[PDB]
Short mmCIF file of C-alpha atoms and ligand atoms in Angstrom, two decimals:
data_model
loop_
_atom_site.label_atom_id
_atom_site.label_comp_id
_atom_site.label_asym_id
_atom_site.label_seq_id
_atom_site.Cartn_x
_atom_site.Cartn_y
_atom_site.Cartn_z
CA UNK A 1 8.43 -10.19 4.29
CA UNK A 2 5.43 -10.13 1.88
CA UNK A 3 3.08 -8.34 4.30
CA UNK A 4 5.46 -5.34 4.51
CA UNK A 5 6.43 -5.17 8.23
CA UNK A 6 2.69 -5.96 8.86
CA UNK A 7 1.23 -3.22 6.70
CA UNK A 8 -0.82 -5.67 4.66
CA UNK A 9 -3.44 -8.06 5.86
CA UNK A 10 -2.86 -11.72 5.14
CA UNK A 11 -5.74 -13.80 3.72
CA UNK A 12 -6.46 -12.19 0.30
CA UNK A 13 -6.77 -14.43 -2.74
CA UNK A 14 -3.39 -14.70 -4.44
CA UNK A 15 -4.36 -15.35 -8.08
CA UNK A 16 -6.93 -12.44 -8.35
CA UNK A 17 -4.32 -9.85 -7.33
CA UNK A 18 -0.79 -11.17 -8.11
CA UNK A 19 0.98 -7.89 -7.26
CA UNK A 20 -0.21 -7.62 -3.65
CA UNK A 21 1.98 -10.43 -2.30
CA UNK A 22 4.51 -11.20 -5.04
CA UNK A 23 5.78 -7.62 -5.21
CA UNK A 24 8.65 -8.68 -2.78
CA UNK A 25 10.09 -10.76 -5.56
CA UNK A 26 10.75 -7.49 -7.42
CA UNK A 27 11.63 -4.79 -4.79
CA UNK A 28 14.29 -4.53 -2.09
CA UNK A 29 12.64 -4.49 1.34
CA UNK A 30 11.70 -0.92 2.32
CA UNK A 31 13.84 0.72 5.01
CA UNK A 32 10.68 2.33 6.53
CA UNK A 33 9.03 0.13 9.13
CA UNK A 34 5.42 1.24 9.58
CA UNK A 35 4.56 1.89 13.21
CA UNK A 36 2.58 -0.48 15.47
CA UNK A 37 -0.07 2.22 15.75
CA UNK A 38 -0.42 2.65 11.97
CA UNK A 39 -0.81 -1.10 11.74
CA UNK A 40 -3.61 -1.28 14.30
CA UNK A 41 -5.20 1.70 12.65
CA UNK A 42 -5.39 -0.17 9.38
CA UNK A 43 -6.52 -3.50 10.85
CA UNK A 44 -9.13 -1.54 12.83
CA UNK A 45 -10.09 0.40 9.66
CA UNK A 46 -10.85 -2.87 7.82
CA UNK A 47 -13.29 -3.83 10.59
CA UNK A 48 -15.03 -0.50 10.19
CA UNK A 49 -15.13 -0.98 6.42
CA UNK A 50 -16.48 -4.51 6.61
CA UNK A 51 -19.06 -3.36 9.20
CA UNK A 52 -20.24 -0.29 7.24
CA UNK A 53 -19.40 -1.16 3.68
CA UNK A 54 -21.40 -1.25 0.48
CA UNK A 55 -24.10 -3.89 0.55
CA UNK A 56 -24.35 -4.23 4.38
CA UNK A 57 -27.55 -3.46 6.24
CA UNK A 58 -25.58 -0.62 7.87
CA UNK A 59 -24.78 0.96 4.50
CA UNK A 60 -28.58 0.67 3.45
CA UNK A 61 -29.89 2.40 6.51
CA UNK A 62 -27.27 5.15 6.17
CA UNK A 63 -28.26 5.77 2.49
CA UNK A 64 -31.79 6.65 3.56
CA UNK A 65 -30.22 9.41 5.67
CA UNK A 66 -29.54 11.20 2.36
CA UNK A 67 -33.35 12.03 2.46
CA UNK A 68 -34.75 12.10 6.09
CA UNK A 69 -32.88 14.94 7.89
CA UNK A 70 -26.12 7.00 12.13
CA UNK A 71 -23.27 4.74 13.40
CA UNK A 72 -21.49 4.68 10.02
CA UNK A 73 -20.14 7.77 8.38
CA UNK A 74 -18.53 8.07 5.00
CA UNK A 75 -16.28 9.96 2.72
CA UNK A 76 -16.81 9.56 -0.98
CA UNK A 77 -13.92 10.19 -3.35
CA UNK A 78 -14.92 11.23 -6.84
CA UNK A 79 -12.70 10.11 -9.75
CA UNK A 80 -11.37 13.27 -11.24
CA UNK A 81 -8.12 14.39 -12.91
CA UNK A 82 -4.93 12.57 -14.21
CA UNK A 83 -3.92 9.23 -12.77
CA UNK A 84 -0.91 10.76 -10.80
CA UNK A 85 -3.26 13.12 -9.15
CA UNK A 86 -5.97 10.55 -8.48
CA UNK A 87 -3.55 8.30 -6.67
CA UNK A 88 -2.23 11.16 -4.47
CA UNK A 89 -5.65 12.77 -3.74
CA UNK A 90 -7.09 9.31 -2.96
CA UNK A 91 -4.34 8.46 -0.42
CA UNK A 92 -5.12 11.89 0.99
CA UNK A 93 -8.82 11.21 1.49
CA UNK A 94 -8.00 7.88 3.01
CA UNK A 95 -5.68 9.37 5.58
CA UNK A 96 -8.49 11.76 6.20
CA UNK A 97 -10.98 8.97 6.63
CA UNK A 98 -8.57 7.43 9.15
CA UNK A 99 -8.50 10.64 11.17
CA UNK A 100 -12.28 10.99 11.34
CA UNK A 101 -13.39 7.34 11.76
CA UNK A 102 -15.18 7.30 8.36
CA UNK A 103 -15.59 4.78 5.57
CA UNK A 104 -13.86 5.56 2.30
CA UNK A 105 -15.77 4.75 -0.86
CA UNK A 106 -14.32 5.14 -4.37
CA UNK A 107 -16.13 6.45 -7.43
CA UNK A 108 -14.68 3.79 -9.86
CA UNK A 109 -15.26 6.21 -12.79
CA UNK A 110 -13.89 4.93 -16.09
CA UNK A 111 -11.09 2.69 -14.99
CA UNK A 112 -10.22 2.54 -11.27
CA UNK A 113 -11.48 -1.06 -11.18
CA UNK A 114 -9.13 -2.04 -14.05
CA UNK A 115 -6.08 -0.37 -12.55
CA UNK A 116 -6.30 -1.39 -8.91
CA UNK A 117 -6.99 -4.49 -6.87
CA UNK A 118 -9.28 -4.35 -3.74
CA UNK A 119 -7.21 -3.11 -0.79
CA UNK A 120 -9.65 -3.89 2.09
CA UNK A 121 -9.79 -7.46 3.25
CA UNK A 122 -13.28 -8.98 3.04
CA UNK A 123 -15.11 -6.14 1.31
CA UNK A 124 -15.04 -3.85 -1.72
CA UNK A 125 -13.85 -0.23 -1.62
CA UNK A 126 -15.87 0.72 -4.64
CA UNK A 127 -18.83 3.03 -4.44
CA UNK A 128 -21.93 1.22 -5.78
CA UNK A 129 -23.20 1.95 -9.25
CA UNK A 130 -26.66 2.87 -7.88
CA UNK A 131 -25.51 5.38 -5.28
CA UNK A 132 -28.13 8.09 -5.83
CA UNK A 133 -25.84 11.14 -5.98
CA UNK A 134 -23.54 9.80 -8.80
CA UNK A 135 -25.22 11.87 -11.53
CA UNK A 136 -24.17 15.10 -9.66
CA UNK A 137 -20.39 14.42 -9.55
CA UNK A 138 -19.51 16.05 -12.86
CA UNK A 139 -21.36 19.15 -11.93
CA UNK A 140 -20.46 19.54 -8.25
CA UNK A 141 -18.07 22.54 -7.97
CA UNK A 142 -17.52 25.75 -5.85
CA UNK A 143 -21.05 27.17 -6.58
CA UNK A 144 -23.15 24.01 -5.91
CA UNK A 145 -25.78 24.43 -3.09
CA UNK A 146 -24.29 21.81 -0.71
CA UNK A 147 -20.67 22.95 -1.29
CA UNK A 148 -19.23 23.63 2.15
CA UNK A 149 -17.44 26.77 0.82
CA UNK A 150 -20.51 28.21 -0.86
CA UNK A 151 -22.35 27.85 2.50
CA UNK A 152 -19.60 29.50 4.67
CA UNK A 153 -19.40 32.30 2.02
CA UNK A 154 -23.18 32.87 2.24
CA UNK A 155 -23.64 32.04 6.03
CA UNK A 156 -26.07 29.06 6.30
CA UNK A 157 -28.26 19.93 10.22
CA UNK A 158 -26.85 18.29 7.11
CA UNK A 159 -27.05 14.75 5.75
CA UNK A 160 -24.50 15.44 3.13
CA UNK A 161 -21.81 18.02 2.29
CA UNK A 162 -19.77 18.52 -0.86
CA UNK A 163 -16.10 19.59 -0.20
CA UNK A 164 -14.41 21.34 -3.10
CA UNK A 165 -10.65 20.64 -2.71
CA UNK A 166 -9.63 21.09 -6.35
CA UNK A 167 -6.62 23.35 -7.10
CA UNK A 168 -8.86 26.36 -8.01
CA UNK A 169 -10.62 26.26 -4.61
CA UNK A 170 -11.10 29.54 -2.72
CA UNK A 171 -10.70 31.23 0.59
CA UNK A 172 -13.88 29.56 1.98
CA UNK A 173 -13.28 26.12 0.55
CA UNK A 174 -9.96 26.18 2.32
CA UNK A 175 -11.62 26.51 5.75
CA UNK A 176 -11.79 22.71 5.50
CA UNK A 177 -8.27 22.87 6.89
CA UNK A 178 -9.45 24.49 10.24
CA UNK A 179 -10.30 22.81 13.61
CA UNK A 180 -13.56 24.75 13.96
CA UNK A 181 -15.09 23.69 10.58
CA UNK A 182 -13.80 20.15 11.11
CA UNK A 183 -15.85 20.01 14.33
CA UNK A 184 -18.84 21.01 12.22
CA UNK A 185 -18.06 18.63 9.26
CA UNK A 186 -17.41 15.88 11.93
CA UNK A 187 -21.19 15.60 12.38
CA UNK A 188 -22.18 15.16 8.72
CA UNK A 189 -22.67 11.42 7.86
CA UNK A 190 -21.96 11.85 4.09
CA UNK A 191 -19.03 13.68 2.58
CA UNK A 192 -18.50 13.91 -1.17
CA UNK A 193 -15.04 15.08 -2.13
CA UNK A 194 -13.57 16.06 -5.54
CA UNK A 195 -9.85 16.84 -5.38
CA UNK A 196 -6.69 16.82 -7.45
CA UNK A 197 -3.94 17.54 -4.78
CA UNK A 198 -1.88 15.69 -2.19
CA UNK A 199 -3.47 17.56 0.70
CA UNK A 200 -1.82 15.50 3.51
CA UNK A 201 0.55 18.21 4.87
CA UNK A 202 -2.09 20.66 5.92
CA UNK A 203 -3.67 17.95 8.03
CA UNK A 204 -0.61 18.02 10.33
CA UNK A 205 -1.26 21.68 11.04
CA UNK A 206 -4.85 20.96 12.27
CA UNK A 207 -4.75 20.46 16.04
CA UNK A 208 -6.10 17.10 17.33
CA UNK A 209 -5.25 15.64 13.93
CA UNK A 210 -1.59 16.43 14.65
CA UNK A 211 -1.34 14.28 17.78
CA UNK A 212 -2.77 11.22 16.04
CA UNK A 213 -0.61 11.91 12.97
CA UNK A 214 2.48 11.87 15.20
CA UNK A 215 1.42 8.63 16.86
CA UNK A 216 0.67 6.96 13.38
CA UNK A 217 3.84 8.21 11.73
CA UNK A 218 6.85 8.63 14.13
CA UNK A 219 8.92 9.08 10.91
CA UNK A 220 6.65 11.89 9.60
CA UNK A 221 7.67 11.76 5.97
CA UNK A 222 6.37 8.18 5.50
CA UNK A 223 2.71 9.03 5.06
CA UNK A 224 2.34 8.30 1.30
CA UNK A 225 5.02 5.58 1.46
CA UNK A 226 2.94 3.47 3.86
CA UNK A 227 -0.53 4.61 2.67
CA UNK A 228 0.35 4.13 -1.01
CA UNK A 229 1.75 0.68 -0.62
CA UNK A 230 -1.31 -0.25 1.55
CA UNK A 231 -4.00 1.01 -0.78
CA UNK A 232 -2.72 0.61 -4.32
CA UNK A 233 -1.98 -2.72 -5.93
CA UNK A 234 -1.95 -3.16 -9.62
CA UNK A 235 -4.28 -5.68 -11.29
CA UNK A 236 -2.97 -8.77 -13.05
CA UNK A 237 -3.28 -6.93 -16.41
CA UNK A 238 -1.05 -4.08 -15.27
CA UNK A 239 1.15 -6.19 -13.09
CA UNK A 240 2.20 -8.27 -16.08
CA UNK A 241 3.36 -5.20 -17.91
CA UNK A 242 5.56 -4.53 -14.93
CA UNK A 243 6.89 -8.04 -14.54
CA UNK A 244 7.62 -8.50 -18.24
CA UNK A 245 9.46 -5.25 -18.72
CA UNK A 246 11.41 -5.73 -15.51
CA UNK A 247 12.23 -9.31 -16.45
CA UNK A 248 13.24 -8.59 -20.04
CA UNK A 249 15.16 -5.40 -19.65
CA UNK A 250 16.20 -4.76 -16.04
CA UNK A 251 16.84 -7.75 -13.82
CA UNK A 252 20.50 -8.15 -14.94
CA UNK A 253 21.80 -4.80 -13.66
CA UNK A 254 23.83 -4.40 -10.48
CA UNK A 255 22.11 -1.04 -10.10
CA UNK A 256 19.04 0.56 -11.66
CA UNK A 257 18.63 4.31 -12.31
CA UNK A 258 15.13 5.74 -12.91
CA UNK A 259 14.71 9.00 -14.82
CA UNK A 260 11.12 10.39 -14.93
CA UNK A 261 10.89 13.03 -17.61
CA UNK A 262 7.97 15.41 -17.80
CA UNK A 263 8.31 18.66 -19.75
CA UNK A 264 5.66 21.38 -19.14
CA UNK A 265 5.27 22.82 -22.68
CA UNK A 266 2.65 22.54 -25.55
CA UNK A 267 5.46 21.51 -28.08
CA UNK A 268 6.38 17.82 -27.52
CA UNK A 269 10.07 18.64 -28.18
CA UNK A 270 12.40 17.05 -27.53
CA UNK A 271 14.51 19.96 -26.15
CA UNK A 272 18.26 20.19 -26.09
CA UNK A 273 18.13 22.15 -22.78
CA UNK A 274 16.37 19.26 -21.09
CA UNK A 275 18.73 16.50 -22.58
CA UNK A 276 21.62 18.72 -21.40
CA UNK A 277 19.93 18.97 -18.01
CA UNK A 278 19.56 15.18 -17.70
CA UNK A 279 23.17 14.33 -18.51
CA UNK A 280 24.52 17.10 -16.22
CA UNK A 281 22.20 15.91 -13.51
CA UNK A 282 23.12 12.27 -13.77
CA UNK A 283 26.86 12.92 -14.24
CA UNK A 284 27.29 15.65 -11.60
CA UNK A 285 25.69 13.27 -9.04
CA UNK A 286 27.77 10.20 -9.90
CA UNK A 287 24.40 8.49 -10.76
CA UNK A 288 25.59 7.75 -14.29
CA UNK A 289 29.23 7.87 -15.43
CA UNK A 290 30.87 10.36 -17.83
CA UNK A 291 32.03 9.33 -21.31
CA UNK A 292 35.46 9.63 -22.90
CA UNK A 293 35.91 11.32 -26.33
CA UNK A 294 39.62 10.65 -26.92
CA UNK A 295 40.25 7.26 -25.25
CA UNK A 296 35.50 -6.40 -13.03
CA UNK A 297 32.81 -3.87 -14.16
CA UNK A 298 29.28 -3.20 -12.99
CA UNK A 299 26.16 -3.10 -15.15
CA UNK A 300 23.75 -0.21 -14.72
CA UNK A 301 20.40 -0.17 -16.46
CA UNK A 302 18.66 3.26 -16.91
CA UNK A 303 14.91 3.25 -17.11
CA UNK A 304 13.69 6.40 -18.83
CA UNK A 305 9.93 7.13 -18.74
CA UNK A 306 8.73 9.99 -20.89
CA UNK A 307 6.25 10.98 -23.61
CA UNK A 308 8.89 11.95 -26.26
CA UNK A 309 11.44 9.08 -26.78
CA UNK A 310 14.52 11.21 -27.68
CA UNK A 311 15.65 11.71 -24.12
CA UNK A 312 16.28 7.98 -23.88
CA UNK A 313 17.77 7.83 -27.45
CA UNK A 314 20.23 10.55 -26.74
CA UNK A 315 21.47 8.73 -23.62
CA UNK A 316 21.34 5.39 -25.39
CA UNK A 317 23.38 6.65 -28.31
CA UNK A 318 25.89 8.47 -26.09
CA UNK A 319 26.56 5.30 -24.12
CA UNK A 320 26.71 3.17 -27.32
CA UNK A 321 28.91 5.60 -29.17
CA UNK A 322 31.41 6.32 -26.34
CA UNK A 323 33.01 4.20 -23.58
CA UNK A 324 32.35 5.13 -19.98
CA UNK A 325 35.18 6.78 -17.99
CA UNK A 326 34.71 4.22 -15.26
CA UNK A 327 34.31 1.15 -17.47
CA UNK A 328 30.75 0.70 -16.18
CA UNK A 329 28.37 -1.07 -18.60
CA UNK A 330 25.39 1.17 -19.28
CA UNK A 331 22.12 0.18 -20.95
CA UNK A 332 19.26 2.77 -21.44
CA UNK A 333 15.63 1.58 -21.82
CA UNK A 334 12.38 3.37 -22.40
CA UNK A 335 9.07 1.45 -22.41
CA UNK A 336 6.66 3.71 -24.22
CA UNK A 337 6.48 7.02 -26.06
CA UNK A 338 2.74 7.96 -25.82
CA UNK A 339 3.06 11.47 -27.30
CA UNK A 340 -4.19 0.32 -22.21
CA UNK A 341 -2.83 3.96 -21.85
CA UNK A 342 -3.40 4.30 -18.09
CA UNK A 343 -2.55 0.69 -17.55
CA UNK A 344 0.75 1.68 -19.12
CA UNK A 345 1.25 4.88 -17.29
CA UNK A 346 0.54 2.96 -14.12
CA UNK A 347 3.09 0.14 -14.82
CA UNK A 348 5.73 2.74 -15.65
CA UNK A 349 5.26 4.38 -12.22
CA UNK A 350 5.64 1.07 -10.50
CA UNK A 351 8.71 0.37 -12.69
CA UNK A 352 10.20 3.67 -11.75
CA UNK A 353 9.56 2.69 -8.15
CA UNK A 354 11.81 -0.44 -8.48
CA UNK A 355 14.93 1.52 -9.27
CA UNK A 356 17.73 2.11 -6.69
CA UNK A 357 18.08 5.83 -7.48
CA UNK A 358 15.41 7.99 -9.05
CA UNK A 359 15.56 11.31 -10.90
CA UNK A 360 12.09 13.11 -11.10
CA UNK A 361 10.92 16.17 -13.01
CA UNK A 362 9.82 19.27 -11.03
CA UNK A 363 6.04 19.55 -10.46
CA UNK A 364 5.21 16.01 -11.83
CA UNK A 365 2.78 13.98 -9.81
CA UNK A 366 4.05 11.07 -11.88
CA UNK A 367 7.40 11.45 -10.09
CA UNK A 368 5.82 11.71 -6.66
CA UNK A 369 3.92 8.48 -6.93
CA UNK A 370 7.07 6.70 -8.25
CA UNK A 371 9.34 7.91 -5.51
CA UNK A 372 6.40 7.42 -3.14
CA UNK A 373 5.96 3.72 -3.66
CA UNK A 374 9.73 3.20 -4.06
CA UNK A 375 10.52 4.75 -0.73
CA UNK A 376 12.97 6.75 -2.81
CA UNK A 377 14.17 10.27 -2.10
CA UNK A 378 14.77 11.63 -5.63
CA UNK A 379 17.11 14.04 -7.29
CA UNK A 380 14.76 16.58 -8.81
CA UNK A 381 15.22 18.05 -12.32
CA UNK A 382 14.32 21.69 -11.63
CA UNK A 383 11.87 23.50 -13.67
CA UNK A 384 13.32 25.38 -16.60
CA UNK A 385 12.72 28.97 -17.65
CA UNK A 386 13.40 30.33 -21.14
CA UNK A 387 14.57 26.97 -22.60
CA UNK A 388 17.77 27.32 -20.52
CA UNK A 389 19.18 24.30 -18.65
CA UNK A 390 18.93 25.34 -15.06
CA UNK A 391 22.14 25.57 -13.02
CA UNK A 392 22.35 23.58 -10.87
CA UNK A 393 20.48 21.11 -13.08
CA UNK A 394 19.13 19.10 -10.11
CA UNK A 395 19.33 18.65 -6.38
CA UNK A 396 18.30 16.02 -3.82
CA UNK A 397 14.82 16.09 -2.40
CA UNK A 398 14.49 17.13 1.17
CA UNK A 399 12.51 13.86 1.42
CA UNK A 400 10.50 11.16 -0.38
CA UNK A 401 7.08 12.73 0.11
CA UNK A 402 4.76 14.12 -2.56
CA UNK A 403 4.13 17.83 -2.60
CA UNK A 404 0.90 19.68 -1.83
CA UNK A 405 0.62 22.00 -4.79
CA UNK A 406 -2.32 24.24 -3.78
CA UNK A 407 -2.21 24.51 0.14
CA UNK A 408 -4.15 26.92 2.35
CA UNK A 409 -2.35 29.87 4.07
CA UNK A 410 -4.74 30.71 6.93
CA UNK A 411 -4.17 31.00 10.70
CA UNK A 412 -7.55 29.63 11.89
CA UNK A 413 -7.12 30.88 15.47
CA UNK A 414 -6.00 34.41 14.55
CA UNK A 415 -8.24 34.50 11.50
CA UNK A 416 -5.53 35.91 9.19
CA UNK A 417 -3.09 35.18 6.46
CA UNK A 418 -0.01 33.19 7.32
CA UNK A 419 2.95 31.38 5.58
CA UNK A 420 2.07 27.78 6.57
CA UNK A 421 5.53 26.64 5.33
CA UNK A 422 7.35 28.45 8.16
CA UNK A 423 5.24 27.13 11.21
CA UNK A 424 6.97 23.78 12.18
CA UNK A 425 10.13 22.05 11.14
CA UNK A 426 8.39 19.07 9.48
CA UNK A 427 6.24 21.10 7.08
CA UNK A 428 8.44 22.88 4.62
CA UNK A 429 8.05 24.49 1.28
CA UNK A 430 8.72 22.23 -1.81
CA UNK A 431 12.04 22.08 -3.67
CA UNK A 432 10.41 21.83 -7.08
CA UNK A 433 7.42 24.20 -6.57
CA UNK A 434 8.23 26.58 -3.74
CA UNK A 435 4.68 27.74 -3.27
CA UNK A 436 3.49 24.18 -2.32
CA UNK A 437 4.22 22.28 0.93
CA UNK A 438 5.52 18.92 2.10
CA UNK A 439 6.44 16.78 5.08
CA UNK A 440 10.20 16.38 5.70
N1 GDP B 1 2.89 5.91 -20.08
C1 GDP B 1 3.28 7.13 -19.61
N2 GDP B 1 2.31 8.02 -19.31
C2 GDP B 1 2.60 9.26 -18.84
C3 GDP B 1 4.01 9.65 -18.65
N3 GDP B 1 4.01 10.90 -18.18
C4 GDP B 1 2.72 11.29 -18.08
N4 GDP B 1 1.87 10.31 -18.47
C5 GDP B 1 0.38 10.31 -18.52
O1 GDP B 1 -0.13 11.22 -19.51
C6 GDP B 1 -1.19 12.01 -18.96
C7 GDP B 1 -0.76 13.47 -18.93
O2 GDP B 1 0.44 13.51 -18.15
P1 GDP B 1 0.93 14.74 -17.24
O3 GDP B 1 1.22 15.82 -18.24
O4 GDP B 1 1.99 14.22 -16.30
O5 GDP B 1 -0.37 15.15 -16.36
P2 GDP B 1 -1.04 16.62 -16.32
O6 GDP B 1 0.09 17.62 -16.27
O7 GDP B 1 -1.84 16.56 -15.05
O8 GDP B 1 -1.88 16.68 -17.59
C8 GDP B 1 -1.46 11.48 -17.55
O9 GDP B 1 -2.66 10.70 -17.52
C9 GDP B 1 -0.22 10.68 -17.17
O10 GDP B 1 -0.48 9.52 -16.38
C10 GDP B 1 5.02 8.62 -19.00
O11 GDP B 1 6.22 8.89 -18.86
N5 GDP B 1 4.60 7.42 -19.45
#
């Protein structure tokens, strides 16, 4: 089913975004049926967006509200940070638009236009190029006059509010995640957000939001799985990088393994500890077979994405040099070694997402998107310390979701510090970065 259990709206033009509909030629159908309520929510959201979207008479009238202090309200995402982050933060702001009956508009920035097709049937998601406040986006931060957190800090009705939700955000910026301040913010027609985190899990802890979030997602850990596949379709340019790598190197395997390598160090390596970690991970989980020194089969292909190439070479040369214990036929394959960039990094994510089993590196938003769109619950390569291969080398994700790296820890009722990862069974601390949070 090319509309994804009904997640996607039929009627888009096939040739201008090939990936949208002919993705089902390349991926096994997802196990995760999106609920009836999520569906309606999206179909209803596209009526809002057509009704209030850029270029309508309702969008023109609303723009004058930026001076003279309103049926359409808006959240504006600003393009900021690495591609992994911008995908996760953008799905976040879109869930948030859903919860607050707003229109999402997207600062195209340098490249968003080039990377992604239009996800909303009948009408562009892109912020116009003449939107008056675009010159301020670089500068908007924690100390800007209309920053919600600067205002709560310094006790201060508004046409527009800036919401600073970047990882270095403070105690007052974080009040965004409270019911009280949401009631306030609820009234403001224009919201400009800049953000580099997957902030979805803290929305489940806001009351009101949590009812609707339960109704939309009966299987709670499907938020980015459905919202990602809804929103983000690669352009023809990027899609062809996907199809041509998949076609040339991966379509003849009985099984595909993905291995997403990120190493957090200012030396590119490669590192023996990390190679060691990857083989122990893959072997100890029966993901890839062992090899024998002193000596009707299946073909596995291993897709290795990384910046240094010698993680893939090592595996490639091991499996060329030595026969597998099981007699399985292994081929290792790395697209790029970057040391058309973001078109590439994008394709590689989507490629990772077509594998049957994925290994991810701890902390990488690159992993989270790949597992995210795959509907894949990874085995996570844990974060090293002192150039030592951790032991155990990896473990299975509690679930497929991305991880909220910089969450708030406030009890809004009681007005005090709290561990927000020990309030409800579905919001747990992360496996990879224990400080962060995620839906399980
Ligand atoms: N093509 C490709 N790009 C990558 C890979 N890993 C990371 N990148 C990109 O390189 C840039 C820096 O990556 P990363 O270190 O993961 O992000 P940071 O930690 O937020 O700087 C980002 O724009 C990523 O999209 C990869 O395996 N392949």
